[PDB]
């Protein structure tokens, strides 16, 4: 039981991710690094207006089977 | 507006009670989103002085945290020559709108009291703190007494 998810840049092409709901958000951000080369520290993920924290799982946020996620660029500040 | 209303209520709790650590609170009558006050440290190397800070509240407060800025100069690993502090409570990461300025200042006092050589802003100093602490406390004590504000009564 492993899912297909969509992930959308605010203004560029949607992509697709092979996962299962145990996977960490951090892990999502790495499969994106894999597909797009975007480092996880540059990625901010939102799902239906709720921001996702790195540590929690997909099952935590109630995400499964073809969910459409909002990706947004993140500044990096000390 | 909403931020201002929330900030007036916070002010009333302090006029009613107040923090001993944070004195002389003066605010912009017009908006309340800029505060100035004095923090008096209790542990060396800062018992000999006091420091002026500025708090700036975003228009979106409290959903967005305020930021703190030392207007008095200070010798401290986690504090910028410019006066800027990374302070976990305000981190966009952690910030909770329920938090009050009161807690933020308490956190600030704590930070001043116990420097954290982990993500420090002045590694130059952060290292002199980990090792060779004795001179450090000399240096800070002098920097405090020279560039530091005078203590209250």
């Amino acid at each position: 039981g492993s899912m297909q998810i969509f992930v959308k840049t605010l203004t560029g092409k949607t992509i697709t991710l092979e996962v299962e709901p145990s996977d960490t958000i951090e892990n999502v951000k790495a499969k994106i690094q894999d597909k797009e080369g975007i480092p996880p520290d540059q990625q901010r993920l939102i799902f239906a207006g709720k921001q996702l924290e790195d540590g929690r799982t997909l099952s935590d946020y109630n995400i499964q089977k073809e969910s459409t996620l909002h990706l947004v660029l993140r500044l990096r500040g000390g | 507006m909403a931020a201002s209303r929330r900030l007036m209520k916070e002010l009333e709790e302090i006029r009613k009670c107040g923090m001993k650590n944070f004195r002389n609170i003066q605010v912009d009558e017009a908006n309340l989103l800029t505060w100035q006050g004095l923090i008096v440290p209790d542990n060396p190397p800062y018992d000999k002085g006091a420091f002026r800070i500025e708090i700036n509240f975003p228009a979106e407060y409290p959903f967005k945290p305020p930021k703190i800025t030392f207007k008095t100069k200070i010798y401290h690993p986690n504090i910028d020559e410019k006066g800027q502090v990374k302070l976990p409570v305000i981190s966009a990461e952690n910030w909770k709108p329920a938090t009050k300025t009161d807690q933020v200042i308490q956190s600030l006092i704590a930070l001043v009291n116990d420097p954290q050589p982990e993500h420090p802003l002045r590694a130059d100093l952060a290292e002199e703190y980990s090792k060779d602490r004795k001179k450090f406390c000399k240096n800070a004590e002098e920097f405090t007494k020279k560039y530091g504000e005078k203590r209250p009564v």
Partner: protein
């Protein structure tokens, strides 16, 4: 088949169509606009030469990782040399491929050594932590300075910083004195001339006359739709306080989602019952915890509070025409003006970038608009636009078009050109909207030809460009003589993050 250790991807490492190995030197994190600020300002550089331990996570030098890469090549050669029993006398040229990479990666490793001690006397590289935040190496500055496709822009925030990291910005305007450059360190000292100043003093004057920002946003509409079922003296109180609120939330929630999905289906799952950290929105939380509302509050303030508390801010932008309208209703403070003055400036800077990278003009638009009466005029037009609720971007393009000759343009910008600037502005500006400081930005266009690239979310130049510049040419390359040239001949300056092996 044999297990191969050579990884399809390595930091800073790119291989083109012709099995050529390029090592890219990161100027800053980012893709098009630089994303690092404050204590991270120079991380990518520092990490490249000296590695990094921050957040307690190990990040290995470029040197270290090339050593690591090399061993995996060396193993990958022995495991083919071992296998000569069934050898075809070639591995379809894979070995040929795999040894070429070794000769190159070994030239690179020499060169790195050579910069640390023989050609590092100036200490440009050896500048970390000496100056507070390290300044860019001279080679990098030279590279940036001559760039056809990547450019810095400096702006005028009311409360500016004294020092600037980029020495040759394309767009540049007059600024106040930084508070940090005053005897008392308390406040900036304002100058009374130029673009920055006319904008701020027009948009929120000394008379304190707010400037109305009149535009209905999707949020404005939802509010009124939902308020159209309440009356002006309805409130939240009685022992039915709690239930009334859950009605309010539930109504609000439906009408919002109804208006939202019209253009983005992603928001059908949007709830307003919790805040982001899981906390039920209720009378206690908003009145006692937050102190934003109370029994006496009108239903409007009850609505705004719930929305502020529950909806991520991205939800409002995706649904908006421009960064200019962020949902505010009036300009009512110096601070508000600052923010908008910056928007306007950043928009020009983007226009100025488009015109430069497209070879329309070599000018500094900032110098033009600093001059009276352009400074005064453009502020006037903009104040006006917010009032009539007209789109702001074209007021800037209209003004720029009225003066195209002066600005070095053969001809006005098309509505198409205009849009490209608006698309870029909106993307980039939204990205850096929450920056701690608006003194400067570094924007790059890896779709254009030039000396600046994009690789693995790093705005980067070529290590050999920099190497050659740093050693003043005194050290020649050998077989890397035209690697540098080759890469710029590549069909794009926007580089895939992985390599091809098989």
């Amino acid at each position: 088949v044999i297990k191969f250790k050579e990884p399809e991807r390595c930091d800073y490492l790119y291989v083109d169509e012709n099995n050529k190995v390029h090592i890219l030197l990161p100027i800053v994190g980012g893709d098009e606009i630089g994303l690092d600020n404050t204590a991270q300002t120079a991380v990518e550089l520092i990490t490249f030469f000296y590695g990094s331990a921050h957040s307690g996570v190990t990040k290995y030098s470029a040197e270290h990782q090339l050593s690591e890469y090399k061993r995996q090549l060396e193993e990958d050669i022995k495991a083919i040399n071992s296998q000569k029993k069934i050898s075809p006398h070639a591995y379809d040229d894979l070995l040929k491929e795999k040894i070429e990479r070794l000769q190159q990666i070994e030239k690179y490793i020499e060169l790195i050594q050579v910069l640390k001690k023989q050609y590092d006397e100036q200490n440009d590289i050896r500048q970390l932590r000496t100056g507070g935040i390290p300044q860019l190496p001279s080679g990098v500055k030279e590279i940036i300075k001559s760039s056809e496709n990547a450019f810095a822009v400096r702006l005028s925030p009311y409360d500016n910083d004294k020092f600037t990291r980029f020495d040759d910005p394309l767009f540049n305007v007059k600024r106040n004195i930084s508070k940090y450059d005053t005897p008392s360190r308390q406040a900036p000292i304002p100058i009374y001339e130029g673009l920055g100043y006319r904008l701020r003093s027009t948009l929120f004057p000394e008379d304190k006359t707010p400037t109305p920002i009149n535009k209905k946003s999707l949020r404005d509409k939802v509010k009124s739709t939902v308020l159209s079922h309440y009356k002006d003296e309805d409130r939240i109180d009685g022992e039915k306080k709690d239930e009334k609120l859950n009605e309010l939330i539930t109504n609000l929630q439906n009408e919002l989602v109804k208006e939202l999905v019209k253009s983005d289906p992603q928001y059908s799952k949007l709830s307003l019952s919790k805040d982001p950290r899981g906390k039920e929105i209720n009378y206690d939380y908003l009145v006692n915890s937050l102190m934003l509302v109370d029994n006496d509050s009108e239903i409007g303030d009850w609505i705004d509070t719930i929305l502020d508390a529950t909806v991520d801010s991205t939800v409002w932008v995706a649904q908006a025409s421009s960064p200019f309208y962020d949902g505010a209703k009036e300009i009512s403070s110096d601070r508000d003006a600052d923010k908008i003055s910056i928007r306007v400036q950043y928009l020009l800077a983007e226009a100025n970038i488009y015109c430069k990278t497209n070879k329309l003009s070599d000018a500094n638009f900032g110098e033009f608009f600093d001059k009276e009466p352009h400074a005064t005029e453009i502020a006037k037009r903009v104040k006006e636009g917010f009032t009539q609720g007209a789109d702001i971007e074209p007021i800037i393009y209209d003004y720029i078009n009225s003066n195209h000759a002066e600005l070095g343009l053969k001809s006005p910008l098309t509505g198409k050109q205009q849009q490209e600037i608006t698309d870029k502005f909106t993307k980039h500006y939204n990205t850096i909207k929450e920056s701690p400081h608006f003194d400067e930005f570094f924007v790059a266009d890896p779709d254009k030809k030039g000396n600046i690239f994009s690789h693995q979310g790093r705005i980067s130049c070529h290590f050999l460009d920099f190497f050659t510049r740093q050693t003043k040419g005194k050290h020649p390359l050998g077989d890397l003589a035209s690697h540098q040239e080759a890469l710029q001949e590549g069909t794009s300056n926007r580089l895939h993050h992985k390599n091809e092996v098989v």
